């Protein structure tokens with residue numbers, strides 16, 4: 001409808017796949033080469049389904065900060081025959097607050113879904129499903145089961161992936177440029 005949705009659509013159309021694990025279907029953001037991200041609670045194993053194709057996992061790393069606190073991001077390297085468009089230059093370098101964000105989801109259950117979530121707070125610490133978690137972004141939208149892995153964007157920036165909610169608020173794990181240096 002406007003330039004926020006324009007940027008979100010551009011990311012969804014080229015840089016997302018549908019990931020299936022034993023824990024469900026997730027929106028999965030491809031970042032560069034064969035490297036993607038998913039919420040750690042997806043419990044990635046040795047094999048994952050990518051757009052319903054059986055795919056070997058070459059590496060999977062559940063990220064934690066230097067206090068050894070959960071970040072709820074898993075970085076996955078996929079044995080896939082095709083590279084993602086490199087979008088690392090759209091990742092923020094530092095922790096921040098944002099205005100006018102969009103949460104975008106693409107699954108069998110929620111195809112081509114775009115939610116204007118509005119203002120995003122650098123919330124920080126969250127007890128997420130009983131797990132102490134850092135670098136959480138919060139938005140005041142009643143997000144629901146099926147949105148985990150959804151991409152949080154502003155115009156020109158890919159800032160997080162949706163990891164939970166409390167019925168009234170939704171929570172995303174930050175994406176930082178420093179996670180994907182090589």
Ligand SMILES: CCS(=O)(=O)NCc1ccc2c(c1)OCO2
Nearest residue numbers: 041072128129131163164165166
């Ligand atoms: C807190 C429940 S939820 O429905 O908001 N999000 C799914 C979820 C489930 C288990 C988790 C988790 C997130 O992060 C750590 O363990």
